[PDB]
Amino acid sequence: TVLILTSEEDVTADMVVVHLNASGVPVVRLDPADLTDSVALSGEFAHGSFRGHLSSGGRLVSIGGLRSVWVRRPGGAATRAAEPSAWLTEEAGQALYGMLRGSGARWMNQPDAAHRARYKPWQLRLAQRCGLPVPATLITTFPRAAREFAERYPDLVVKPVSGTSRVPPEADFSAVAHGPTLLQRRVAKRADIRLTAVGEELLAARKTALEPWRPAEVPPRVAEGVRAYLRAAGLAYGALDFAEDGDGTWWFLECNQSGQFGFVEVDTGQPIARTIAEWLARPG
Amino acid sequence: TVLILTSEEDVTADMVVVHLNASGVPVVRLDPADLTDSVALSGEFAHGSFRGHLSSGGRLVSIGGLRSVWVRRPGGAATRAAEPSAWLTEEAGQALYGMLRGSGARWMNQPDAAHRARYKPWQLRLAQRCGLPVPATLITTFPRAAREFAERYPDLVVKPVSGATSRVPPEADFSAVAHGPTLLQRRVAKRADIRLTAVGEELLAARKTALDVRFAGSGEPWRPAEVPPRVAEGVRAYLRAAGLAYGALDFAEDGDGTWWFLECNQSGQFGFVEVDTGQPIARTIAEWLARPG
């Protein structure tokens, strides 16, 4: 059984659940936000073993029977309870995500990998370690360091640090003392790339920068780097962003471990949804 | 250089900065809440490598130069900034803890290990897997299951699920589990209480008897305890699986002498056990953090 953790308003999951059922994989779809309302659970650890079940709308499913947990846009635990409470949300999150941890299921982004992966400064160091070109980048709170970085790269771009943009002209960088900020050399962009990774599968798309998404072959070296990266982050799904050069170089910007994917499969018709279902349907 | 990340207040940390200072191991302590004020940073990602630095007061160290990071009760980043902001402590949070990831430094609790380790239901599963004993435990929002569980085990306690206590009436209506996850545990005899502090693979355990009783003026202290060899195997295994350089595990002693696992708090205190037993937990930490990076 594949277990899908998402909000009811999520419409990109529907496509994956349709492929799962066509393949004869049973599927349970619930919002962790419905805990103590639509959803229940039990877990007994005794005599060295663990037994445990989930229930949604009445249908029960062995927790040991989950072959896959796909996590995509779930609400915070029991946050749609009769009397929501950050305590209720914490006890519920722990009951659920703690009894799933060690279940034996495969996670479409294991929560702990996923936690580590939201840190963009980590993403960049990892991309370098993997061979992906990254644009020169400084994140700093010394105006002086900012000023000298702008000497080397006078044509810069300003982006946030966390996991949007702008251009700096001639400036003092004095306000960097008051908040850590990210300067990045600008890329002579000609396309946007959106690489969706599903396992070792890479489904990339291209929008022009001078319009709809269109299917993009992945240059062999980027493919190599993206698999090392996926593999090192221990991520089963990633939505990566690159900028494409006049030379055709793909410049890493961001890997989003839960980035949307519906908007590409619409335009390009690439089977991303079917590729996820395939991944999730493998039996642990 | 050793990097401690704590509040100015932290007592248990001071204990360790002295040992470090004694041994000439270059330390740098600071609260992340002092970012954009007393504390500031810069990192450059260029030409396939990273070069960055940290500055507290005038002190300045290379991030490549860090050999370890002790994470001991620090502040929300830039919370004690001149002009605090949720958005700003988010952007500082990433700037600091994101450049430290992959920096090259031995984390006293890696932050991602730590995140997984707070999940108390996981901690039970894992100690089970490591051979440590575990009292029968139900986690539930199922009145029926709670009521069958009490049937099987009528001497129960009721810990809270989360890992980031009370006893059960002998005839209780378990109906409000439907409104809140509940953890029911069979109670241990409990001759003693065990506090195992784990610093790398070194285990410093301590015992405190449990049960004239009443007008005693709180004068039953912690006393050094010897770790059953097979427990030390499971405990060292647990830390290895979880990724933890440091852990503060609580056991209940059986009277038969067995050591029932209750929880492993990765952020847990150890000061209160070293004042009583004089076991050198702080200096063991200091040595661990002083190792090369």
CATH of B2-108, one of 1.10.3470, 3.40.190, 3.30.70, 3.40.50: 3.40.50
Given a contact cutoff of 8 angstroms between Cβ atoms, the answer to whether B161 and B126 are in contact is no
User: Cβ of A137 and B45 within 8 Å?
Assistant: yes
Q: Report the alpha-carbon distance of residue A32 to residue B291 in Å, rounded.
A: 43
- Calculate ∠ Cα A108-B48-B96, nearest 5°: 65
Chain B neighbors of A178, CB-CB under 8 A: 36, 81-83
Cβ-Cβ contacts under 8 Å for A189 (sequence gap 6 or more) = A209, A243, A244
DSSP bridge partners of A283:
none
Pairing of the two strands B68-71 and B39-46: unpaired
Task: Report chain A residues whose CB lies below 8 A from the CB of B119.
Answer: 94, 97-98, 101
d(CA A247, CA B146) in angstroms, rounded, equals 65
Q: Is the dihedral of CA B71, B73, B76, B77 positive or negative?
A: negative
B114-132+189-278+286-290 fold = D-amino Acid Aminotransferase; Chain A, domain 1 (3.30.470)
The amino acid sitting at A90 is E
DSSP string of A89-125, one letter each residue: HHHHHHHHHHHHTTSSPEEET-HHHHHHHT-HHHHHH
Please tell me the distance from the alpha carbon of residue A129 to that of residue A25, in angstroms, as a whole number.
Answer: 38
Distance of alpha carbon B196 from alpha carbon A138, whole angstroms? 43
Instruction: Flag whether residue B258 sits within 8 Å of chain A, measured between CB atoms.
Output: no
Element holding B253 (H helix, E strand): strand B246-253
Phi and psi torsions of A238, nearest 5°: -145, 145
Residue B251, helix vs strand vs coil: strand
Contacting residues for B162 by C-beta, under 8 A, at least 6 apart: A90, A91, A94, B118, B120
B202 DSSP assignment: E
* B42 interaction partners in chain A (CB closer than 8 Å): 138-142, 145
Q: How far is B135 from chain A (nearest CA, A)?
A: 7
Q: How close are the terminal C-alpha atoms of chain B, in Å?
A: 9
**Nearest-neighbour CA in chain A from B107: distance (Å):** 14
Are B102 and A129 inside 8 Å of each other by CB? yes
- Please name the residue of chain B whose CA is at the shortest distance from the CA of residue A83: B179
On whether any CB of chain B is under 8 Å from the CB of A224, the answer is no
Cβ distance A121 to B93 less than 8 Å, yes or no, reads no
Q: Which ranges constitute the DSSP H helices of chain B?
A: 11-22, 86-100, 111-117, 120-129, 143-152, 229-242, 271-277, 281-290
Q: Which of B44, B112, B164 sits opposite A115 (nearest CB)?
A: B112
The resolution in Å comes to 2.9
CB atoms within 10 A of CB B236: 17
Dist. CA B261–CA B137, nearest whole Å: 12
What is the identity of the amino acid at A108? M
d(CA B286, CA B200): 11
Chain B residues with CB inside 8 Å of A119's CB? 94, 97-98, 101
- Architecture of the domain defined by A116-132+188-268: 2-Layer Sandwich (3.30)
The contacts of residue A154 (CB under 8 Å, 6+ apart) are none
CB pair distance less than 8 Å for B83 and A45: no
CA distance, residue A250 to nearest chain B CA (Å): 15
B residues 115-134 lying closer than 8 A (beta carbon) to A? 115-116, 119-122, 124-126, 128-129, 134
Distance from CA of B214 to the nearest CA of A (A): 34
Tell me the C-alpha distance between A246 and A159, whole Å: 22
Q: Judge whether B28 and B287 are in contact, CB under 8 Å.
A: no
**Gap between the Cα atoms of B286 and B283, Å rounded:** 5
Q: Which of A49, A56, A122 best tests the B interface by mutation, with the highest count of B CBs <10 A? A: A122
Residue type, B277: T
Q: Are A196 and A261 in contact (CB under 8 A)?
A: yes
DSSP run (H or E) holding B249: strand B246-253
The dihedral of CA B253, B256, B261, B262: what is its sign? Answer: negative
Does B158 lie at the interface with A, CB-CB under 8 angstroms? no
Interface of A with B in 195-214 (CB under 8 A): none
